[PDB]
Design a protein around this ligand. Structure first.
Ligand SMILES: c1ccc2[nH]ncc2c1
Length: 168
């Protein structure tokens, strides 16, 4: 149904809300939720852990089966697997982990994966355990994504700082 509500329109195609992505997925029934994935699709932490827990581990079971046959993703890459109870599809996107020395330039590649989907519910890529500057990630999103992206930011402080930064 893609019933997004209460987002702040930043650009013609980028929207943001102070919200929990799992609660958004349940409320909105999106066609596509983006996972903040790693290359092995091991969803024990970060947003991936929240989405996997909300699927009662179905996402992890499917991901384990996928990797054993298909091999890992690349940093800046993606795959489309089931959305389980959260969405029709899950776009697993690997942003660079700058806490582990990966090239922040790959954040552009990471966001280019969104352009294959008309509308997405997504987290800010390379935030949290991936260590990237969230203000920078929002700028790469705005400059790279052409399709409609609805960003959910959990932390009110960080949301407020992102909106302030973007309106400068
Ligand atoms: C086949 C199955 C799993 C794999 N992982 N990496 C390469 C590869 C090939």
């Amino acid at each position: 149904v893609n019933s997004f509500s209460g987002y702040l329109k930043l650009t013609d195609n980028v929207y943001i809300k102070n919200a929990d992505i799992v609660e958004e997925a349940k409320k909105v029934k999106p066609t596509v939720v983006v996972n903040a994935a790693n290359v092995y699709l091991k969803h024990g932490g970060g947003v991936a852990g929240a989405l996997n827990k909300a699927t009662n581990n179905a996402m992890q079971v499917e991901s384990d089966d996928y990797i054993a046959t298909n091999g890992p993703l690349k940093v800046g890459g993606s795959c489309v697997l089931s959305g389980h109870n959260l969405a029709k599809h899950c776009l697993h996107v690997v942003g660079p982990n700058v806490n582990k020395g990966e090239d922040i330039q790959l954040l552009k590649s990471a966001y280019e994966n969104f352009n294959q989907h008309e509308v997405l519910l997504a987290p800010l890529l390379s935030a949290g355990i991936f260590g990237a500057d969230p203000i920078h990630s929002l700028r790469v999103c705005v400059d790279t994504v052409r399709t409609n992206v609805y960003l959910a930011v959990f932390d009110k402080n960080l949301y407020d700082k992102l909106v302030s930064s973007f309106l400068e």
